[PDB]
Design a protein around this ligand. Structure first.
Ligand SMILES: CCCCCCCCO[C@@H]1O[C@H](CO)[C@H](O)[C@H](O)[C@H]1O[C@@H]1O[C@@H](C)[C@@H](O)[C@@H](O)[C@@H]1O
Ligand SMILES: O=c1ccn([C@@H]2O[C@H](COP(=O)(O)OP(=O)(O)O)[C@@H](O)[C@H]2O)c(=O)[nH]1
Ligand SMILES: [Mn+2]
Length: 286
């Protein structure tokens, strides 16, 4: 049950004036595409706070990637779901290397020890996430992100919905034939050249606990079939994520404001804010 919103004073939405004319703000299956200017955060804050919403954030920090945690967590404190209940789940092979980061009120962090794989690290996240009964008891939504990242601007309850994906910053302008989907029919992740809505980033997806568990279970199962079939998808977990979200349409899609790389891609006109961004790294070294 959901109580009434309080009286609120804000600018009237204008039916004959779009918020944004430069971008698509709704998908053909009527899911919002979340861009700056499309949402009144005060209204959304009210709605989610009235439900006493708790947001779980999962992050894997395996082997050298423990180095990324301090910046990741400190910036999350400044920008991620501020004012709402947050539970961070940090999956790591080195619990002692987790930095002591000061948390605001209503926010907690749990350290979950896991093994370290020698592609496998990235891929096993789906399995590791799918944990099941615990998330259901502790949080309302789960957000699953990469750790080699920092928050630079607001990432809030505007993202929350049963199931979301994020537009990959390199491909939001690309035609579907150019998308780097798995193209081999022998893989569970296979998507033909005439199919595909968007290319979603593996580094930021989420939803209700129920929908995230479904997604992660399905992707884990598909990866297992592939392994038994001697095939590994071209972009690993991301390829499977893309297949899942093709066949199970997300109820919101996050714009590339939510997963950006400024070093690689700059700051184009279509982006009013850079919210959650790649931290430069030496890939093979790290
Ligand atoms: C120099 C490398 C240029 C890579 C540009 C394309 O992007 C890659 O696209 C792949 C799918 O086709 C994967 O999503 C990969 O994770 C991504 O690279 C990642 O995300 C990117 C946005 C960058 O942050 C890159 O450094 C990451 O390795
Ligand atoms: O040695 C590793 C490699 C990967 N990861 C995790 O898997 C995610 C995805 O890998 P990475 O960020 O290297 O992929 P990219 O964004 O460069 O495609 C990382 O953010 C970490 O959360 C990790 O913890 N340790
Ligand atoms: Mn990454």
């Amino acid at each position: 049950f959901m109580v009434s919103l309080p009286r609120m004073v804000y600018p009237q939405p204008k039916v004959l004036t779009p918020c944004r004319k430069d971008v698509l703000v709704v998908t053909p299956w009527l899911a919002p595409i979340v861009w700056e200017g499309t949402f009144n955060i005060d209204i959304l804050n009210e709605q989610f706070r009235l439900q006493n919403t708790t947001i779980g954030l999962t992050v894997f920090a395996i082997k050298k990637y423990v180095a990324f945690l301090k910046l990741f967590l400190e910036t999350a404190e400044k920008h991620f779901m501020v004012g709402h209940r947050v539970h961070y789940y940090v999956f790591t092979d080195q619990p002692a290397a987790v930095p002591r980061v000061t948390l605001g009120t209503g926010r907690q962090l749990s350290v979950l020890e896991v093994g370290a794989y020698k592609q496998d690290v990235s891929m096993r996240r789906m399995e590791m996430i799918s944990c099941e009964r615990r998330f259901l008891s502790e949080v309302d939504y789960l957000v699953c992100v990469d750790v080699d990242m920092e928050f630079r601007d607001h990432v809030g309850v505007e993202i929350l919905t049963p199931l979301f994906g994020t537009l990959h910053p390199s491909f939001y302008g690309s035609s579907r034939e150019a998308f780097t989907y798995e193209r081999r029919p022998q893989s569970q992740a296979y998507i033909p050249k005439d199919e595909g809505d968007f290319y979603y980033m593996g580094a930021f997806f989420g939803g209700s606990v129920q929908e995230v568990q479904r997604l992660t279970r399905a992707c884990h199962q598909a990866m297992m079939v592939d392994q038994a079939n001697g095939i590994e998808a071209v972009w690993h977990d991301e390829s499977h994520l893309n297949k899942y979200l093709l066949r199970h349409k997300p109820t919101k899609v996050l714009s590339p404001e939510y997963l950006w790389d400024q070093q690689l891609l700059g700051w184009p006109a279509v982006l009013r804010k850079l919210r959650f961004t790649a931290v430069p790294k030496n890939h093979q070294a790290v």
